[PDB]
Amino acid sequence: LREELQLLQEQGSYVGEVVRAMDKKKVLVKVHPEGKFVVDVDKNIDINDV
Amino acid sequence: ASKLPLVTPHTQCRLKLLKLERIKDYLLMEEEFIRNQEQMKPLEEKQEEERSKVDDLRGTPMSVGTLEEIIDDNHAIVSTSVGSEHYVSILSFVDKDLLEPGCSVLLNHKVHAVIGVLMDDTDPLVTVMKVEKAPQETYADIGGLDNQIQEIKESVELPLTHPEYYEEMGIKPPKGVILYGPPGTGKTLLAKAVANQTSATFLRVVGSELIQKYLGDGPKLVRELFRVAEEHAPSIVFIDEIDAIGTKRYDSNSGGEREIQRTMLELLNQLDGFDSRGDVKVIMATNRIETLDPALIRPGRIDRKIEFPLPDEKTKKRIFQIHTSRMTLADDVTLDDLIMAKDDLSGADIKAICTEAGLMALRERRMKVTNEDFKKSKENVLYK
Amino acid sequence: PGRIDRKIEFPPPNEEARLDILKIHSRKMNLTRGINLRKIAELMPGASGA
Amino acid sequence: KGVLMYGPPGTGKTLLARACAAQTKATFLKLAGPQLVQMFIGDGAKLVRDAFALAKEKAPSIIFIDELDAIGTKRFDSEKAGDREVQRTMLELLNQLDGFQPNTQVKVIAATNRVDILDPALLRSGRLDRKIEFPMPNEEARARIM
Amino acid sequence: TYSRQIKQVEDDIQQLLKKINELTGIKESDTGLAPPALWDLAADKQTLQSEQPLQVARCTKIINADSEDPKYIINVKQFAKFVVDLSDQVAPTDIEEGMRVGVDRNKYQIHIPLPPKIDPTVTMMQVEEKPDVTYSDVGGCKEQIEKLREVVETPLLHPERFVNLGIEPPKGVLLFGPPGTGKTLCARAVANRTDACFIRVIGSELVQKYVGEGARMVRELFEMARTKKACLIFFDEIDAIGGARFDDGAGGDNEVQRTMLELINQLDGFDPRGNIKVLMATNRPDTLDPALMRPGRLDRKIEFSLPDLEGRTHIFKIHARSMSVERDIRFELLARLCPNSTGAEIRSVCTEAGMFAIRARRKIATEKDFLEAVNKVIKSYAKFSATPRYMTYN
Ligand SMILES: Nc1ncnc2c1ncn2[C@@H]1O[C@H](COP(=O)(O)OP(=O)(O)OP(=O)(O)O)[C@@H](O)[C@H]1O
Ligand SMILES: Nc1ncnc2c1ncn2[C@@H]1O[C@H](COP(=O)(O)OP(=O)(O)OP(=O)(O)O)[C@@H](O)[C@H]1O
Numbered sequence A: 001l002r003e004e005l006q007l008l009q010e011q012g013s014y015v016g017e018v019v020r021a022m023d024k025k026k027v028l029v030k031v032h033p034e035g036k037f038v039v040d041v042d043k044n045i046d047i048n049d050v
Numbered sequence B: 001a002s003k004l005p006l007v008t009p010h011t012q013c014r015l016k017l018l019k020l021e022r023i024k025d026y027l028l029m030e031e032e033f034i035r036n037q038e039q040m041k042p043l044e045e046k047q048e049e050e051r052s053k054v055d056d057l058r059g060t061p062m063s064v065g066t067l068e069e070i071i072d073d074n075h076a077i078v079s080t081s082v083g084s085e086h087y088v089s090i091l092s093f094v095d096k097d098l099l100e101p102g103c104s105v106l107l108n109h110k111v112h113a114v115i116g117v118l119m120d121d122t123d124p125l126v127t128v129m130k131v132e133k134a135p136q137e138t139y140a141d142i143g144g145l146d147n148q149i150q151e152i153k154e155s156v157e158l159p160l161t162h163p164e165y166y167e168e169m170g171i172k173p174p175k176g177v178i179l180y181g182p183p184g185t186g187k188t189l190l191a192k193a194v195a196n197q198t199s200a201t202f203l204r205v206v207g208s209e210l211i212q213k214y215l216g217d218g219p220k221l222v223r224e225l226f227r228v229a230e231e232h233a234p235s236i237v238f239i240d241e242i243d244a245i246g247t248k249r250y251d252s253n254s255g256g257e258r259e260i261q262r263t264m265l266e267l268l269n270q271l272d273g274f275d276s277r278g279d280v281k282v283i284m285a286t287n288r289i290e291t292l293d294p295a296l297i298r299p300g301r302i303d304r305k306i307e308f309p310l311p312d313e314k315t316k317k318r319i320f321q322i323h324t325s326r327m328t329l330a331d332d333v334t335l336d337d338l339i340m341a342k343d344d345l346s347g348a349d350i351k352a353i354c355t356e357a358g359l360m361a362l363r364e365r366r367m368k369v370t371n372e373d374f375k376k377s378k379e380n381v382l383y384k
Numbered sequence C: 001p002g003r004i005d006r007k008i009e010f011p012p013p014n015e016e017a018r019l020d021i022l023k024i025h026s027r028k029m030n031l032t033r034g035i036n037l038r039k040i041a042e043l044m045p046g047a048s049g050a
Numbered sequence D: 001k002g003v004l005m006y007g008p009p010g011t012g013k014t015l016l017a018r019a020c021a022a023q024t025k026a027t028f029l030k031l032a033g034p035q036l037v038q039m040f041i042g043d044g045a046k047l048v049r050d051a052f053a054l055a056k057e058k059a060p061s062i063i064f065i066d067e068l069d070a071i072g073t074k075r076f077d078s079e080k081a082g083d084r085e086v087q088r089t090m091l092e093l094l095n096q097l098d099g100f101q102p103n104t105q106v107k108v109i110a111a112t113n114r115v116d117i118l119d120p121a122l123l124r125s126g127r128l129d130r131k132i133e134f135p136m137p138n139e140e141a142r143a144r145i146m
Numbered sequence E: 001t002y003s004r005q006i007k008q009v010e011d012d013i014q015q016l017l018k019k020i021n022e023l024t025g026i027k028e029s030d031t032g033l034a035p036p037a038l039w040d041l042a043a044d045k046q047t048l049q050s051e052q053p054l055q056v057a058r059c060t061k062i063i064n065a066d067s068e069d070p071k072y073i074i075n076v077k078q079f080a081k082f083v084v085d086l087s088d089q090v091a092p093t094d095i096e097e098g099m100r101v102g103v104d105r106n107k108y109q110i111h112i113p114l115p116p117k118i119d120p121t122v123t124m125m126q127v128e129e130k131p132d133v134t135y136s137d138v139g140g141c142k143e144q145i146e147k148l149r150e151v152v153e154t155p156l157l158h159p160e161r162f163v164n165l166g167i168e169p170p171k172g173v174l175l176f177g178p179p180g181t182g183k184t185l186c187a188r189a190v191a192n193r194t195d196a197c198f199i200r201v202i203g204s205e206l207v208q209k210y211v212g213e214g215a216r217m218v219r220e221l222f223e224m225a226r227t228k229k230a231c232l233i234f235f236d237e238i239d240a241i242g243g244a245r246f247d248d249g250a251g252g253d254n255e256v257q258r259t260m261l262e263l264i265n266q267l268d269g270f271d272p273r274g275n276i277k278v279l280m281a282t283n284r285p286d287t288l289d290p291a292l293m294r295p296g297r298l299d300r301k302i303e304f305s306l307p308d309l310e311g312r313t314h315i316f317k318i319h320a321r322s323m324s325v326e327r328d329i330r331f332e333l334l335a336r337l338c339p340n341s342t343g344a345e346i347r348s349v350c351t352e353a354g355m356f357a358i359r360a361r362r363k364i365a366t367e368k369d370f371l372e373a374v375n376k377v378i379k380s381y382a383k384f385s386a387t388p389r390y391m392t393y394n
């Protein structure tokens, strides 16, 4: 309970939209009205799961 | 990759043994030369050391922008995805050849410099117009014409499959082919036989969907059609029912008849403009040949003009042999009574009867088609 | 004739067919016993099912 | 205030306007007809009042409008369709020339070659005053021209 | 004899090519990367040179300068307008008003002037490449070629025979006749031989979707044309761009007439176009506007009629000089069988009659192979014919 005073100052996470993945562990994701971003994946997420 | 294009002796000669053993020395000496790079200058691994250096150069956020110009000293004005455009620089691992104005690129996140280009995801209209697979059965499915089946091969198939006969003549093939006749005689049927046979890319568009609801969206649609047709291959452009551009007036089209006109002027350009045309064959089809513009049917735009007649009464019997081939037809029936039923029944009517008589048998779960099936079939199909 | 596979005509309903359209739509109404829906259906000389 | 020249297209209308640009040492300001037509709304209207405010600043100035039938086409009543945005640039050109808050500092020279197309609201008497015509050269002028 | 022995010694060395080129680096088929042994210049040096010293310089557009001081008024795409200054690396000379410039992201000061926007749908209509039609292929209309060639290229190739005589040569020219006559064909021969910029415009490309959008494309054409020392504009099928002003009731086709009026203003009056020569080509000239048929815009009015007899016999010699024929045929007999025919039909006769030789077996056409082509092209396709309602130009 008293951890959240030093936990909520961490900035929030964006939400986006996958179009399609490609070679060498990256995906093409677009944001709300913001441009498409070629971003990488984390280690706990499978590409075929995306 | 494309190391040597000579294959010409095609035997067990010493010349084929000499050439490839020469190339054997051009490869090993090239191998042993480049092997001694890492032997005396290790300095990296080069499988990843140049790669990770690039991958650490380019940022993990990668924003997507747009080209609009190039200044060739590796910096160009690029447009960001909001609309505020910059004057960033271009790198050296960028392969500065695949850059056109309008190509989607990858930018840096920090200084927005052009890192890499992006392969485009195209298109939601190319796949609309491009025929995916071969439609149906062969030329043997047609029957009865036999005079213009030769004609279409003469202008489409034979220029493509035998490019020696026009050369020994010293001639170029006839350009345009139009197909006309009464409705239901096999105009659309013959074009499927071409798309069965050919190895070209085959594009189809109907004449009714050439007209648009906005001004000038019509002639834009034609210009990008022939752009698609030219940029692929030797290709075949099939435009069906082109009298429908001028007969039916629709209230969606804000421009009236003088927007139909400006579209046909663009179509009149794309067949015989002054531009370098390339290897594009044009097939057209209609059933009201007297309505459309005679400037579009002049030689130079359409050379061959093929008429389709009504089926003759001994070609009619051939058509019944086709559409009743793979059905378990009972021996009650006599096809020759069916032939002269309508004096001018088209080839479409024959399939319209043969498909309907099968539907009456499934009402009674039967497997063979009897005579009274056909007796009530032409009452259902023709007479209404 | 080769274009449309089967055409299906919808006539206006008759006295036997006006009854069961009433029968299905009187399902969700709280009725009173003793109605004789047959007499109701004959008053409409085939308007439609609407 | 406001002159109008008209006639057949080869009689010489620009030739007087290029003559007056060389003679008087005033602030000459020229316009094309379809230049006052914009894709966005109200920009051709804004472009009119910017031009007359510029000629308001240089107080000895005359303004020239070539091909006035581009914007001064006659208004019409119709439903379902029809252009409207062109009339807004015309209806301010009526007002910003003449009407509320008038001025005597700028002079308008207008030139077209067809007249029956034009809106009678811009041919009133006060907006375009002296409507002169240019006839084709009779006999003697052709001896002078060539 | 050594059947497998020449095969496996061929096949392994074709594999051994691939087996060591994977050990150099051309591989990993990319998503937009370079060949690996090509970027090595920016590997250590220009990586930390074209990135870390060099800055981004966001580009803008200048409204105006002002006196006594630099104090430039600048403008950007959607954000505000600023008051800026120069850098040391540029003079205040070439920072003239209404000019795109690059500007840093912090101080907002001007780095370099930029070449202006070219509006890329006008960029695609500069020809960049010459076709292969020679004046030797436009036979039968020599007098029309001579009267055309003395306007387009002789004031360009020798701009001294006219100036010392004291005459200003004509500028505009249109080419008109029935279809299939040689108008677009003769235009290709001009772009073959010339040397200035040849900017082509098909008249069906100026129809746009918004209001006044077509008229701005006329300017951006004539802006970049005035920058050139000499340019050669080609208009094709101008019956779509404007026939005549006829405005009645509901204003219909009012939009296309304003595009036709802006084209008129760019041709005459008020500090003219200078050394720009235009060249139209239409199919029916009777619909065109009298203020566009006025000389000073369209001085020359070259006619393309049908060939007479020696025009026709020359065209047979053009389209049959390169085909395997019987030696002993006469073309003069053939041209008497085609009284009112176009040059496009005569080429279709020559291409059709070569097909009859391909129909049976043979390798060279005969005279009766020609005559089986004439009655099919001239007399059996005579239902369509395309000409007799265009000789009257209606
Ligand atoms: N001569 C023929 N031989 C065999 N089948 C035929 C023949 N003519 C028509 N058919 C049958 O009729 C059907 C429709 O023919 P098709 O639509 O090609 O005629 P069409 O003239 O193109 O029609 P439309 O004029 O409406 O475009 C085809 O599926 C074909 O099976
Ligand atoms: N005088 C000629 N000599 C040689 N070939 C000709 C001649 N006239 C026409 N042709 C042939 O006509 C074709 C070009 O016609 P072109 O496009 O110029 O017709 P056009 O006059 O422009 O009418 P349209 O605008 O309808 O095309 C070429 O294939 C060319 O070989």
Ligand SMILES: Nc1ncnc2c1ncn2[C@@H]1O[C@H](COP(=O)(O)OP(=O)(O)O)[C@@H](O)[C@H]1O
Binding pocket: D008, D009, D010, D011, D012, D013, D014, D015, D113, D145, E268, E269, E291, E296
């Ligand atoms: N004395 C003259 N009288 C009439 N026209 C002349 C005379 N001298 C020259 N011109 C020609 O008249 C033209 C003027 O064009 P103009 O008729 O004003 O065009 P528009 O009226 O369509 O704007 C010039 O090209 C000029 O060559």
Ligand SMILES: [Mg+2]
Binding pocket: B184, B187, B188, B189
């Ligand atoms: Mg069909």
Ligand SMILES: [Mg+2]
Binding pocket: D013, D014, D066, D067, D111, E269
């Ligand atoms: Mg004028």
Ligand SMILES: [Mg+2]
Binding pocket: B272, E180, E183, E184, E185
């Ligand atoms: Mg042409």
